Design a protein around this ligand. Structure first.
Ligand SMILES: O=c1[nH]cnc2c1ncn2[C@@H]1O[C@H](COP(=O)(O)O)[C@@H](O)[C@H]1O
Ligand SMILES: O=c1[nH]cnc2c1ncn2[C@@H]1O[C@H](COP(=O)(O)O)[C@@H](O)[C@H]1O
Ligand SMILES: O=c1[nH]cnc2c1ncn2[C@@H]1O[C@H](COP(=O)(O)O)[C@@H](O)[C@H]1O
Ligand SMILES: O=c1[nH]cnc2c1ncn2[C@@H]1O[C@H](COP(=O)(O)O)[C@@H](O)[C@H]1O
Ligand SMILES: O=c1[nH]cnc2c1ncn2[C@@H]1O[C@H](COP(=O)(O)O)[C@@H](O)[C@H]1O
Lengths: 337, 350, 336, 355, 344
C-alpha cells in the first residue's frame, strides 16, 4: 500500500553563499529590463535592480514616484479598476522630477503597470495612454497559455512599441513559451497572480537562468530575468543577481516603508504595517469592492534602499565585479550546510 | 517582528457509538444522497445511489471510469483539461453505452462533465448537447468572479435545466458567494485545505476536515434563511472508509476522490510493474501536461494498484454501512443528525 | 490494539493577538478584586491590576510593601507557620505609608494565602494581623476542600472577611466556588503544592463568569494566575476577561524578592522555586533546593512602571480608557 | 532563565543481558520485614491493581486474588461503599488467601477522613491499606501513618507514596510505611489531571529509589518493599521493573482492559473498547458530589477520558503475561524475584533499528 | 557566525522500469584496459567486510561456494591472518569462485604499518586479492603501501584501496596503482571511527560522485577501475541500486555478521536468537596488539540460504529494468529521486 512521489529538489537563497575572491561607490547597479539582441542596448535600463511587486499592499502612485526617484520601477497593481490603475500610472508620469532618478525620453518618472489575462483588451490601451513605460502580466505558473494569448494581443496590436513582461515561471518550458511569445522580460517565482500561496526560489531562478542563457546562444536575444519573491535579507539580493537575475521584485520589503499604501499600526509598542497577498479575497475579488499579516515599519524608502544597495555594491567589490554582468560572470556560489 | 493568521485532519476525529442495543443490519443502510440543490421538503433533481464521485482529472475520470462508477451508483465528472470535442465524445460514449445502476430518464448512465471559466460559452452547449447530466466548474483559483460569470451564463441561457456545481471553498464567504450565484452544489477544498488547485498536491488520505465543518455550518445556516439545501461535496484527501463516514457525518453530501479511483483498472493511466508489485501512474491537474493541454514522461507519482472498481468500492461501502449501523443510522441524513463526533487528542499502540 | 484519548484543546497566550481599532496617562488601570452586585462598588479596588503569587520565592513583607506602594496587592505565602505569615502580614499593615493602595485606616493593603487544612487556626490569626483579603492557595483537584474553607469563613465571618479561591479551569469549577461565596475566582493550570493552556482556561471561566453574572447579578472578578511571559500578555489577559493578573516569576526578579541574588556566568540572576518543591510543600520539616534561576531585573518600581506604561499604551490604541472598556472593545485574533 | 532537570529514561531503553519457566517463583513480599525474618503478606504474583475508580472494585479484587495478586479498592467513594467492596471480596469464599482462607484484598485511604475510613476498612477485613495522595509525600501522609501506628500499632499494614527520590523514600520509611510506591507512570510524585501514555513509565525513579531502599536496608536491617506504580503494559517492562528493584508492580490501564473492570464495554466500529478515566478527573476528584451513583448521568464529553482496547478476561491475560515474565527470568538465570535483582545484567539500549 | 561548507540515502532512490535465471551477476574486481578481461571475476557481486566480527576462515569458505570473496580481517597477528587465509585456500572445492589451482578464492586485509612483513605472509599463504583497511581515508601512507607492492610484486599481487567519497580521492588512489577503489557508502565519510551508522542507512551520494570520476578516468586512460560500495546495505533493492549507480561489487559487514558462519557468538535474547557484533572502531579491534559487545544484530541463519534469497530478488529486479548483466544495468537503468513515500 505504498505510493511514490517524484518531486524535483528545490532550495532557497539561504542555502547558498557568495564566496569573495576596490571602491564600493564605483560599482554600477544599472541593469536591463527589456530584451535586446547581442551587442545592442536595451530600450529601458534601470539604475538600480529593484522593482516593487504588483500588489495592492505595495505599488501605488506614491511607491512609484519614490522608487523611480531611487532608480527603480514600480509595477502599479492591477487588482483594481482600469480607470484607477491608469490614474495611478498618470500621477507618476506627471509628478515632476537624486542622481539615480530614472526618467523617460521626456524627463518623466518611469513607471510600470500590471495587467491580467482577462480584460487586457480594455486595460492595455488605457495603461499605454496613461504613459506606462512597461507592462507585466501578473499571473502564475499554471496559467502560461493565457499569458501567451495576452502577449499575442499586445504584439498583434502594438508590435514591439509596447514593452510587456510575463510571469511567473519556474522551468525551461515556461520560460521558452513566454520567450517565443515575445515577452520583453520573464518573471521567476513560485507564486504570482491571485493564486493562493503556502520556497524553491533559488532553484527556480537557477533553472530559468540556465534556460535563458541557452536561449541566448540559440537566438542571440538576451531576455532579462526578474526574481520575484523570496528576498529576506539584503545579501539575498546580491545572491539573486549572481545566480542570473537581472533585477529583483520585492513585496514585503517595500510594504514596510512610508510610501507603502497600507496602514501603520502600533502592535505591542512596535510600529508595524498591514500586509496581504494578491490571493486574499480583497485583491482576488476586488470587483466586489481583512489583513493577512503584519510587517515591521522600517521608515523611508530612500533610507532603506540606500542601505541595501551599499551592501550590494560592497559585496560586488569583494567579488571583483564593477557591474551586474561582471558579477554574474565572476561569482562563486556554493552550498551552505 | 512578523505575525500571521488552525486546521485538523480526519485522523483526529471519531464517531462515538450510539446507545442503541437493537441489532442493525448493514445491508439495510441506504447510501443515497442528493447532488443538486432543492427546496425544503422536495426531492432533489439528481440522487446518486452511492456518495462517491470521481475527480475532474486526466488521470481519473475518462469514459471507462464513467461507466464503471455509474454501474455502482456514482457519477464521474469527465475531465475538462482537453478539447471541447474530445470531452463531448467521452460524455456521449458513456451516455450511449448501454445499461445499483444510476440511470436517467432514458435508462442511460448518469455522467458529469467539468467546465472552466474561459471557453464556457462554447463548451457548455457542446457538453449539454452531448447529454451531460450535471456540470461542475473546475477552477484553479477558488471562488472568483469568473466562476460567477460562468454560473450567470448558464442561468441566463438554460435557466435551471442544466445543473452546474462550483468550487472550491473553505469558509462561509466562499459558500454564500457561490450559493447566491446559483450553484447547484458547492465543492469544499478538503484535500489540501485550500481553495486553489496548484501543482503541489497534499498526501494521500491527509485531507483537512476543518474546511468541511466550516462550510457545513454555513450551509445549514443558509438553509435556515432561504429554505434551500445546497449539497456539499468533500473534495479530496480521503481513501480510508472511516474518513468517508466522518466526512458524510460532518455534513458532506457526497465525496469527490481522485487518487482513490486512479488505482483501479478503469483508471486511464498505465499499469506498471515496480519490482513485482503492480503500480499505477498518476499526475495531478496542476501538472504541466494538464495545465497546458492546449499545447499538445509526465509521471508525478506511482499509486498502488488495487484491482477493479466494483470490488474495491463494494468493500469500502460495506464498511461505511457497517460504521453507520454502529452510530445508529440507516441513511446519510440520519448519520448527520445522530452522529456524536469527538476530537481525538492522541492514539497509542498497546 | 489502539487507545484513544480525548483531551480538550488548550491554547497559550502566545497564540492570540490584540488588534487596535487618546493619551496613555489618561488610561485607568483600576480594577475590582471583591465581588460586587450589579451597579455596586467593590469593597476593594486596586489601582493597578497586578498581584504577586502566593509563593515563598515571591510574596513576603517586603514584596507586599513595594507592590502596595505601586497600587497592587501581595498575597503573603502560606507555606510557613501561622505566626510567621501573620507577622509578615502585620509588618505590611504597620509600615507607615499617588497610586498607593491604602485601606480605611491609611494602611497598606495586603493579602494572605490560606490552605484547606489549618484554616480554623490560620484564618483568625491572619484576620487579627490585618489581612485585607484572603485567598485559598489550592489547585483544580481540591475544589471540595476549597469549598469547606469557604464554608468555614462564611459560617464564622459571613461577608466581613474577603477570601478568594483557586485554581479553576472550567465552568463547573467556577460555579462551585461562586456558590460557596468566593469573593474572586483564580484561574490557572497550577496553584497549590501540586507539581507543574492558560488562555483557554481564562476564556472558559470568563464565559462562565459572564453567564453567572446574568443569572445572579453578582460580578465575581477573575484572577489570571501564571503564564504571563511578556508585558503584552498582561493586556491580553485583561482583554480576555481577567480583572487582575497574578505573577510569580515576574516579581521574584526584583530586589524586594526574598530570594538570593546570584552571579551566574557574569549575569546577575535570582533563585527561584515553586510551591511544589519540598522546601515549600513540606515546610513543617524545616520549621539549597533551587528549582531554577531567573534574571535579576532591578527594582520593582522601575519594572512595574515600564510594564504598565505598555499596558496603558496598548489600551489607548484599542480605544479603551479603562479595563472594562478594554474587555468590550478588544479584538482578539488567533496568530500562527 | 536556567532550570534544573534530571535525565529520565523509559523502560523501553533498557535491556536484560542473558531452565524451566514453570519452576520460576513469582512470589514477592509487600510488607516490611527485618533481616532474616519472613514477610507478613507474600503475594504469589507481583501484580497489584491501581487504587482507581476505573480499575479496582470487588470483581477486580476477586479475580486478581484468585491469580495470586492483591487489588486496592479505590477510596474515591463513600466510606460505606468502599467498606462494602472490601467486605464482598473477603466474604466471597494460585489463589492468595489469608489465615481465614478468604481472598486477600487491599484498600486505599486518603489523608483527610482516615479517622473514620481506616476503622471501617479494618472492620470490613482489609488485609493491607495504601495512602493515595495527589500531591506526593507530605506531612499529611506522616500524620496518617502516625494515626495508624497509634491505634493499631503494626496490626494494620499501610503503604504510602508516590516517591521518586531518596528523601521521599526515607520520609515515609521513618514514618513507618510498610511499602513505598514509586511514581513511575508519570515520573512524578503527583497524580494530576493529565496522565502519561500507556506503557511510558519512567524507570529512572524506580532505580533511584531502589538505591535508597538498598541503602536503608543496609543500615537498619529493615527491607521496605518497593512498588512500581503504573507506566507498564508490556511483559518485558514487568521483568525489567522487577529486575531494577521493584518487588511488585501496580497497574491501572493494564487491568482496565479486562472484563472484570467496572467500566462500560463499547463496540467502537466493530472493535470492543472500554471507557477509562484517571483519578485526576472530576468524577473521581469530586466524588463527594456523585455519592449515590451520580456519575452515570455524565455524558461522554464529561465522563470518558480515554478508550482502552478490550482484552478479555483477567486470568487469560495475566497467565499470558506471567508466562513470559517467567521465561525472561530463565534467560537471566533466575528462578525467583530476589535472584533476578542480584543476577540481572541491565544495559542501556542507545537505539533500536529494523533490518 | 560559523558558516559551514548534501547527501541522500538509498531509501530516496527508485529504479524506473522500462528470465531472472538468465541474469548474470558476474562482475570484475581488478583493473583492466578497454577490451581485455579481468584477472579476477566474481560470480556474485558480494564481499564481506574487513572486520573481526564478519570475516573469519569459515566466512571465507562459505562466501566462496556462493561466488564471492571474503577479505580476512587484518586486526590480528600476521600469523593468525595468514593461517586464516591458508585454511580457506586449502579447503577442498555450482557457483564456486575458484582459482587456477581449483582452490577457493579468498581475500585479505592489510594496513599502512606492517605491510613490509604482512604482505609477503599473505601472498605466501595464497591470498588472491588484498585490500588496504584505512582508518583516516585515502592518505600518503596508503600510497606508499601501494608503491611497496607494485615495487616488489609488480602487478602479480592485486591490492585495493579506500575509502574515497570524492573525485580527488579516487584519482589519487587510481594514479597510485590501486586495483579497485572502495567508496565510503556506509558512513558517508572517508574515515572508519568508533560510532558506526545504522544498518541499511548507507549514503548513495558518495557512490554516484565516484562513479562519475571513475567513468571520466576510464574515458581518459582506457583503464577500468572497479568500484566497491562499502557498507550501509542489507536490503536487496539497495544492492540493485548500488550496482546500477556504478558499483561493481558491494562490501557488507552487518549483512554477513547475522549468519551462522559469522565468528561471533549466538545468544538467545528472550526467545529470539541474536548475534553479537562490534565494529573495527571498537578497542578490541584497534588494540588487537595488547590482547566486548557493541551491538546485537538479528540472527538470520546460514549464508547460502539468505544470499540466494537476496540475489534471486536482485536478478528479478534487474529483469524489470531490462538488463541481463551488471554492465547493462549501469547503462540502461533509469534512477529517479523519491521525494517521499506514503502508505495508503
Ligand atoms: O497571495 C499571494 N498569491 C500569489 N502570489 C503571492 C502572494 N503573496 C505573495 N506572492 C508572490 O510573492 C511576491 C512577494 O515577494 P516577497 O513578499 O518579497 O517575498 C509577489 O510579487 C508574488 O509573486
Ligand atoms: O495537481 C494537483 N495539486 C493540488 N490539488 C489537486 C491537483 N490535482 C487535483 N487536485 C485536487 O485534489 C482532488 C483529488 O483528491 P485526492 O482524492 O486526494 O486525489 C481533485 O479533485 C482536486 O480538487
Ligand atoms: O510548583 C508549582 N506548583 C503548583 N503551581 C505552581 C508551581 N509553580 C508555579 N505555579 C503556579 O504558577 C504561578 C506563577 O506563574 P508565573 O508568574 O508564570 O511563574 C503561581 O502563582 C502558581 O499558581
Ligand atoms: O488522573 C491521573 N493523572 C495522573 N496520574 C494518574 C491518574 N490516575 C491514576 N494515575 C497514576 O497512574 C497509575 C496508573 O498507571 P497505568 O498502569 O499507566 O494506568 C495510578 O496507579 C496512579 O499512580
Ligand atoms: O567501527 C566502525 N565504525 C565505523 N565504521 C565501520 C566500523 N566498522 C566497520 N565500518 C565500516 O562499515 C563497513 C560495513 O558496514 P555495514 O556493512 O553497513 O554494517 C565496513 O566495511 C567499514 O567501512
Amino acid at each position: 500500500a505504498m505510493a511514490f512521489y517524484f518531486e524535483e529538489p528545490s532550495r532557497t537563497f539561504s542555502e547558498f553563499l557568495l564566496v569573495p575572491g576596490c571602491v564600493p561607490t564605483n560599482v554600477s547597479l544599472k541593469t536591463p529590463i527589456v530584451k535586446f539582441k547581442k551587442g545592442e542596448e536595451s530600450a529601458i535600463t534601470m539604475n538600480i535592480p529593484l522593482v516593487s511587486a504588483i500588489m495592492q499592499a505595495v505599488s501605488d502612485d506614491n511607491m512609484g514616484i519614490a522608487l523611480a526617484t531611487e532608480g527603480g520601477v514600480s509595477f502599479i497593481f492591477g487588482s483594481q479598476s482600469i480607470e484607477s490603475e491608469a490614474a495611478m500610472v498618470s500621477r507618476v508620469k506627471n509628478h515632476k522630477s537624486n542622481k539615480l532618478e530614472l526618467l523617460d525620453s521626456s524627463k518623466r518618472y518611469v513607471v510600470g503597470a500590471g495587467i491580467n489575462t482577462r480584460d487586457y483588451e480594455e486595460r492595455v490601451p488605457a495603461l499605454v495612454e496613461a504613459g506606462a513605460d512597461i507592462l507585466c502580466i501578473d499571473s502564475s505558473e499554471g496559467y502560461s497559455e493565457w499569458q501567451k494569448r495576452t502577449l499575442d494581443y499586445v504584439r498583434g496590436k502594438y508590435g514591439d512599441t509596447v514593452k510587456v513582461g510575463a510571469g511567473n515561471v519556474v522551468d525551461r518550458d515556461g520560460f521558452r513559451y513566454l520567450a517565443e511569445a515575445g515577452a520583453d522580460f520573464v518573471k521567476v517565482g513560485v507564486g504570482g497572480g491571485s493564486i493562493c500561496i503556502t520556497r524553491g526560489q533559488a532553484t527556480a531562478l537557477i533553472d530559468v537562468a540556465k534556460a535563458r542563457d541557452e536561449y541566448f546562444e540559440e537566438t542571440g536575444v538576451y531576455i532579462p530575468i526578474c526574481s520575484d519573491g523570496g528576498i529576506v535579507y539584503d545579501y539575498h539580493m546580491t545572491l539573486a543577481l549572481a545566480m542570473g537575475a537581472d533585477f529583483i521584485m520585492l513585496g514585503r520589503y517595500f510594504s514596510r516603508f512610508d510610501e507603502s499604501p497600507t496602514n501603520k499600526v502600533n502592535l505591542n509598542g512596535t510600529y508595524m504595517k498591514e500586509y496581504w497577498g494578491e490571493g486574499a479575497n480583497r485583491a482576488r475579488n476586488w470587483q466586489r469592492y481583512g489583513v493577512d499579516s503584519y510587517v515591521p515599519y522600517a521608515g523611508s524608502l530612500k533610507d532603506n534602499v540606500a542601505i541595501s544597495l551599499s551592501k550590494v555594491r560592497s559585496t560586488m567589490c569583494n567579488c571583483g565585479a564593477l557591474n551586474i554582468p561582471e558579477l554574474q560572470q565572476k561569482a562563486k556560489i556554493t552550498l551552505v550546510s
